[model samples]
Target: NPFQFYLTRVSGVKPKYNSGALHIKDILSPLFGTLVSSAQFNYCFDVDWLVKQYPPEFRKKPILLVHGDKREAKAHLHAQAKPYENISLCQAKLDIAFGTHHTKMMLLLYEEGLRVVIHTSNLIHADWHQKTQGIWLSPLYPRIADGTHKSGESPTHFKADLISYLMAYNAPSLKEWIDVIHKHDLSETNVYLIGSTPGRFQGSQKDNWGHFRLKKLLKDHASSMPNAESWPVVGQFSSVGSLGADESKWLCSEFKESMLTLGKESSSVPLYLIYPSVENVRTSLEGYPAGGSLPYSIQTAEKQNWLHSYFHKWSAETSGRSNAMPHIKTYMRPSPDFSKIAWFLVTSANLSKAAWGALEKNGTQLMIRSYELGVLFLPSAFGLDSFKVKQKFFAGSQEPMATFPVPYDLPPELYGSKDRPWIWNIPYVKAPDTHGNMWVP
Candidate 1:
């Protein structure tokens, strides 16, 4: 299985159906490693709470890079973690205004090997328990026999991209991780790393991260397609940003350009925006309160009313998460019948300028605010000709086809005539949700 949705607790979806899915505890299992170091955002990061989630052998001596560049906050975290002498804490630099240390990842080390996990879950207990999220787990990579580190790059240049994203932190602690990364044989890794670091970048160096990376990925790595323009693009996310007037100023123009297939024209590529409607959120497993994580504001939605035209109701019934509010972010370009896909991505990045970046000063420079990371699943990287959405009991051997397990249903449903996209800031007293509660915030 390539990727999976997180199992939800106390939700309508039976937990058994999520057996093969990525649970928070699944990635932290002892099978992966015996030690851990992770970089993530923290609104309610209880160290004791997180430690229990890991396997006993893997819970010791963790290096936690958490959000806080403040005096009292760091001290507060330190005081809280005082009992755990094995813990090493580093303050994630959050200097850029409106920017967040949003990259959620872990570096697992053991005597046998090291594994990298780039995922969408917050360290918060509540986030893991109820929300629908996506995760990508790397194969355990062992050291080479020679025992020497490569400064940067492998065939896919994943090492170089990872080094660049980590170095952007300017934190001395991360250098140790960089060194460990270079020491591993990442040659077997099949995915392409695409990341975003806070900065205004220019020149050829600009393509290293964000949507520019996507542009380069499609141009250089993507194999030419027959009727490439027919592959429609779909973006699914829990939140939205101020994307300017209509979709053209940003979404359909700049960002859309980045998601195109090779030899594809932007205007010809059909785009679908997958987001939850108020009905979808209110009737969700957690009911109206789940809208807090689905953070689209009424003010922003009003500004770009044209966005309604492309809006598709969030539906994950295939994974039994249709009622579980999705905090996961995924983008894909699938064939018209949804049997094949050109490419797929699961990211910490949302559909926003801050996460994907925006061009400035006559497209001469790129400006990005948050620290985001994601991997692109290109069939070429996996040494396959293409990816197919295979159902159970396939008839043929896994030859040139990469059988991708898509999380949501194929050919998503369009919003109903009166359906309105969920806006968190909007007050809803018209009808109570399944939990007999109305959204007031």
Candidate 2:
């Protein structure tokens, strides 16, 4: 049922890895058999550290690591994968300039079937131990029946979308993996894929990717009632990119319209942008540097004065995720009455035009710039009446989907005049630094 999947920020990192919120060991154990994982970067310590957690028998299984770049020190450590043939490493890069293999996901091939896990944390210890990350899991699927189509034309939402994303890489290294996935029966899953590849797309917003693409996908999946009470949307991210020069051309406006399904009633959607505050960092688990990757210029803030009112604090304690900083990015639309969710997304995309792309002149194309991915969940997908329920409901059933949990409180707190967001602290710092520059990992 994939019911074990829940969203939360773990603290202290002492609890045993279990169904509550998956940790590294949950995916590395031999029970799932051979494994394949993808990420933008990996540490040598992370590699050996994870393997050591398993038993001797589990350590013997092959782990295929697909990464974008190689770490000088860590790259050599894959040979340390002992008790079996060494770890297999593959470098999957994008031909497009400046693109990264930033997707964080894993595939577990077992005797019974396959399990797909998509999450926001990296393979490093810091992310798992102290960040407010999110995860989405797909139901295990059996081998495809003979005579199954090779083109991934099945009705399964998660399967078709995942295969499409994999094929976009078109790397020789991934061809075999793609073929293997094609033979699985993914038609029974319900998650919808919203991803960005390195390319320029034309025609219908639906034909594009990134924020615009997500907007288009939301329109197709969500059931909107025009003039029905609208809800507030909160965009929380680890980084902030260029949002063009003015409000009419603002990416937030486009996101509001597309995400809220406002169509002609664009103002109905209220957007709140959550970012870390200096106060939050001062009170963080590590202090000073925690959540510092969150960037924004004083100049940009002054330019977008309208956004002043929408800014809010990224309080770890307030969110009940104390000691866990926010590297996670999310966009959530809560129902007007504070019950039920209209739509929600957890993604690897940041707030830049490069990550989400900007709208084209004719409004029919999206000028995408990065390789990013995320999942979009709509109330309709769960078969819930979007307007009435105070909680998530399951499709084809009337009961609330209690198995799924949200990490944050409803009706988020807003920013006040005294609450200045945590600044980028680089290139345009308001104060002199006694310490060397804080780097973004």
Candidate 3:
């Protein structure tokens, strides 16, 4: 049944139903795996916590490219990593206020080959335990052969883009990882790397990072779909940032405009936002405490009250993760009927100006505040030739490689008249949570 689709996994569900799910431990294990070294990038880090998840074959230290914005945070992470002598602890530059190195990615180096994993969970035990997460694992790329360079969205281009993203860090240790890319053959990989590097990108390179980059990539590819003009764009995420009071400001204008584009002609595609409500979190498997990472502050929520109309409940009964609190951030465009999908993306980005970017300085340049990364999978990518594939629903199986597994239910549920969106900062006392605990603050 798993052969019904490929190239995506829902994390933290039961074993039998989660046969295709990629748990945190699955990526670290050596079952068709390695004597591996890894370079991980995350906003949160617990090296001692992550080390235990690795199989016995790879308990050795790894290069942890962690983020700590303040001096106190940097010093604290340094002290935490100090007990382990072999760890190469590198701190990323969080120069912009409120911006972060919020990328959750791992580059694996193995005795056999190389693999790239771009996922949506922090490297903490709690993130892996019961939260809903997503992972995109690249096939183990072999060593590249002599005299060959395949270009475009193919492996060589994916390799180049990855190296470009890593180079933005300007860390000396990353140089070796960049060099390591040249030796690997990524021809089997089928996803495009979309990354955001913090910068005021202008002039010659204005569209190289963030939403503009995505716009350019999609403009070149999305329009070719048979009915791309009619498919709606759906965004599912964990956090919310202060978008302007009106919905059309950034949410409906620039961001929406970027999502549905043709070369010279853009479509008026409908857009949706799927975020859990208070009840969805309160009744979650872990109850109110499970919403710790769904960091939509009450302050921001009030400012963007217009966003409430666009909310969709996080429904995933098909994957058996209906009650697990979601941390996964995804965006997709499917046919209105949910049978065919144009593309799907699993990313570290959330519904925020910092992660996706915004126009500033009189629209002269795009200012991206955080470093985020995700793998974009277009049907055109996996041999579709300007087409789409049927969505993979578990109730019925399809021919091998003909469909894609959708983690959440389609035609999502909208908020009822009495429902409020989940806000992590505020207290919830209308009723006790599933844990029989009331949130006091």
Candidate 4:
């Protein structure tokens, strides 16, 4: 059946080494010699052949651009700088062409708009739409939810995520996207992070050193930079039924968690929070009975102008009950009322060393791969005119779903475990579970 729909493209060149037809004909021709059977074979022209079909300008097509995790590339490029054409040294150039041995390049002819051709196998799932004869607009992934797919939800962190993706692919290359961000003055646009602590949510002792270091660095950068603003955060354990209440625990070094100092000229950017477990929320709220503890309540100045959608809520159904559950589904339940978001930033940065190069029990989580790449996309790129393809998704009219995100919420069983009193583990061992009896397995 694969051959049924395989020969309809101009560049579907079947390699001679892996020729199924050659192998099959060699084995079957002799057996069928006595019979006069009618059979047909299909073949189409490839890139070389198609060039002759087009005009001179279309024949010598230019190089395709790309972007993605540039960690290894940066290291290798800076090792030697004589050429001045350093691919690893981050720069703003439209013609920079970079790809792996297995190059995944997508072409966008500006005149035609959204004319995309990816050489690698596309990861876009077919559950949402059928394959088309028209040019492929953009690559898409199913929206990740806890397990249930919510109706009419766009498959992105924020509505701006879809726009960002479109911008990435349509732009000439990855560097262009960052340039656009800088041109638009979005560097200190969102809430700046301060230092973070490697908590239980990051993983066990072996995993913490590597997983949470960059988050802390990003946080510290936000805190110290004159152009950046800082958001103070407090952590607490999530509660499970009557297991007990988790207490407010300090996450950063004492200097990191102290009152944030702001300059008179500091920009009035919105505050964002990396919410802790639900048990922690309940405990922080309870600490509020005495005041000066948890600040989401009206009494605290920290939350005075804070937007509710900016904070992550610990929904058991969405986050699941534990951190160890692999392949747990993710769902998007954006506030139906709060519909507008300016932008979305998705990165591998964690509460650990994973995003920033840090020593780890498993060494670098990225080193296992050949080379890392980082891609950034914006809304109306040079080659992405297929914006209409995702319009339905943004209106909350279609829901996208995926099962690829790591579960950050806790399981019901973890409540009692996290609350166990221990002299060594401190916050983790002595944490409380406030949800008395509301949880279901």
Candidate 5:
């Protein structure tokens, strides 16, 4: 009975949000013959149908242009998004649609190119306010142990400043940070996350314990923070988190019901939605089709992979892609450390707002987003001097710290997978105990 009522209510006509069914004739109409793309058939002029498919809350966040294809906040939010000319109160946001960093120096130049736009824009961004900072590692490769140990839980040199900025801006990742905020009573926190799967949460027993401890922390710091009231609002870019888990499952299942109960109250709060840059996730973006109209089309799910592959190819194609000259003639001595590399780090976490909000299970949500504004000294200018500090602190302190390991006699017991070198090369999680699936579950 309740299900019937719920469906009927959702189907009812209302201001701005009319709901109902489509005509049978429209579905069978000859106009459908002209369909060109995969997304066209999904919506057929019905605004309500569109809303049902994608709510406004999840469709309007600013687009972030990232380097390579990894979902880094800096590349997307700060580097890529170029707002309307005049809308930039202080500086025009430079949207670097492609994320490519041949080297840290080149990355710095890319950042500076962005600042030229920012300084030209009128908006007083965090960078202008002194609120923004960065942590640069002279060389990130040496510090990142070649995956011979556990996800190196070593104390990073960039810890202090990274932690402070992380807690303050909700960068890197928003979910875990919000949990910490909520637990410690860091009130009045406004976090807008636009992710692939927004709103879905995977709450569990471990979640309860963590949330409880965090809540206690928030209570003590309630007075320190300026605002402390409502929980953060989240929006998903695609669906939110995984459909299999309880945290995400419950969130998706109960969302519609929760909307009905809250009614008009839902619109009063700050709205956060997950909108995608490209709607569908099909096609490969490598070579173009014979009659394709667009010169460069990114195959949906393949964008990131394509970006990495393209850069790698681009690196190999050019004579000076990494450096300009030869150091020695005898044996072609190892050249300067000028080879630029754009790193893309994608984990089990989906690029959704809810995932950023720390509500999903296993979603630590503790990430740092360092938006680059200028080139060259920006790395040194930002607090990465501090990340460097943490890296130094734990550099040689490798004990049982097995963030990753070398392949040897003993394979990984948790997942039974062989150990490997490189952080990105290893499994997302150490092993799979419950099922055969890895960290995603």
Candidate 6:
């Protein structure tokens, strides 16, 4: 009942909107009466696939499709002209070498309002089928009275970060896109924009976001901390890329360090990785094939033996739901006693240097590789006094503490019994047992 305990107390308030998959249609249906803007890394987008999800009367409007993978988009168009014709593909010319246009989001424009979404998952079928993804839905904003601004600039609080990310596009094609986004009023939204733009950033104080930016935000915003020794920082992600060895640091190491206070003892903070295994997939609603896109490498695993002790099995079955294979990338620092959270982030960036970027000696510049964006939520932002707990009496009898929602249940399992992280395109070395049990390592 620990999981349900705090959540129940916070149920009547702002934290009440917890749990459930925010499916594509759940986000797009609201915009059915108006224009919709969308962007993705890759596409197997089926207009019919999405259209059928909504009510029959849903308006079918032109979709603004922004992407970098031209070849994939072209193929999708060639394969299905019916849906493709309604889409306008504009190349996101902004990208780092070998980086992706990997942000997954949608902006909806209605006659009197607007909404924005940032999520994890592609525009493809498998991603939406049964895989777990996270979605941050902004409250719909009413159009500003008097129509003073034409460029669609965001409210002042979010304007700088939003514009900085948009400016990275630097392409003439994004002019209209930028103008349209600027008009939306995000004044009432309770969200922090943590984003990345490709290229080397200079100057002493430029906020070039990525791993380091996230660290700074944590240091500046994190109000409390669990005893670092016992509570390891946990990162659960779908993909893994080389984070450099010895001379170069693993990005996760940086993330682990970010969990501690600036002068905290180094040995106190630890890190862990949670990834799904073959057995996990075999027992999934759709066997083996479900997690094909999730990737990692054996070579990097071998080099980073320091990471082995920190490996944890992704407890999909324990998620208290079925068919929920994870694609969501999340990071959290749980209280040592497992009572609450210190801070958490559900984002599109995975366990890769490209997505998080590397730290320089001066620590001022973050050489980001992709145009990625996500929000970071701290307890203070929501007026929640303590992520640990704050109790109030109910029925003039019982007191219950308000709590944060955790996607997976605790007392996590570690990978060993022959369990391994899912690697893209690579077949499992040993086929899963017919009983859906993984072998011992």
Best by TM-score: 3
Where does candidate 6 stray beyond 4 Å?
1-20, 30-59, 71-84, 147-156, 204-206, 224-231, 246-248, 259-266, 299-302, 316-318, 360-364, 388-402, 429-441
lDDT of 4 at 190: 17
Measured by lDDT, the strongest candidate is 3
**What TM-score goes with each of the models?**
0.91, 0.80, 0.92, 0.22, 0.18, 0.80
lDDT of 5: 0.19
**lDDT (Cα) of model 6:** 0.59
**CA-only RMSD, every prediction:** 3.0, 5.3, 2.8, 21.6, 27.1, 6.2
Give per-residue lDDT, candidate 2, residue 175.
73
lDDT (CA) for every model shown?
Answer: 0.76, 0.60, 0.77, 0.23, 0.19, 0.59
Residues forming the 10-long window of minimal summed lDDT in candidate 2: 388-397
Per-residue alpha-carbon lDDT of candidate 2 for residues 1-441, written as tens digits (9 for 90 to 100): 233334443665434312256566655565655443322223123576555655565565556666666466334544554433645666655566666666667676666667777767766666766677777776666777688655443343666667777777677656766777787877656567778776667765345567766666666666566444567777887767656565557555665566566333337467777777655655566555564445566666666666556667775332356445677787767667556566668887776677776666677667766667777766566665453332222122244352234455456677666776666553423432223333343
Candidate 1 to native Cα RMSD, angstroms: 3.0
**Which of the predicted structures, 3 or 5, would earn the higher TM-score when compared with the native?**
3
- As a whole number from 0 to 100, the lDDT of residue 183 in candidate 4 is 24
Question: lDDT of candidate 3?
Answer: 0.77
Model 6 agreement with the true structure over 1-441: per-residue lDDT tens digits: 121211111111122222333456555665434544443333235555654654444444556666665576566654553544555665676445877777766766666577667777676666776666666777766665564854333332455566667677776646665666666666665556777767776674334477666666666665544344676577888777776664226444554555454221235555667777666666765556656666566666667655546668766332332345677787777666556666667778887778877666576556767767777666655565446522221111132333555566554678885766665455554566434644332
Sorted on TM-score, highest at the top, how do the candidates line up? Answer: 3, 1, 2, 6, 4, 5
- In candidate 1, what are the lDDT values of residues 1-441, reduced to their tens digit? 443223334234565556556566767776666654544434346777877887776666565655544678678878877887777776767666887667777777767777778877777676776677777877778876565645434567777778777788777778878778877777766778889888888998788879998888888877767777788999998888899987778898889988885633337888988998999988887788889888888778888888888889987666667787888788988987888887889888888998999999899888988888888888777666568875431123274246776677778899999899999987989999988988786
lDDT tens readout by residue for model 5, 1-441 = 000000001121232211221122222123322211111100002322322222233323222221212446433433322431211111112233321211111111111111001110111121111111111111211122233443212122122222332243233433343332222211111111111111222433221111222232222212221111122222221122222233233333333122112112212222222211110101112111110211122222232321111110011011110110110000000001211101101111222222222333354332211121111111111222111111121123243121111101111012112321111112234433222433221
Candidate 6: C-alpha RMSD to true structure equals 6.2
Give the better candidate number (1 or 2) by lDDT.
Answer: 1
lDDT rank order? 3, 1, 2, 6, 4, 5
Residues 1-441, model 3: lDDT tens digits: 322222234444456556666666777778746845788888888877877777865776465555644688877777777876667766676667778888988888888888888888898877877777888778778866557664423542688888899888887777888888878877666777889988888886777788888888787765545566678889999988999989778998899888776455634677889998899999987789877888888888888788899998988876777788788888887786766777777889998999998998888799988999988877666665323343433445545354666778888888889888989888888899877999876
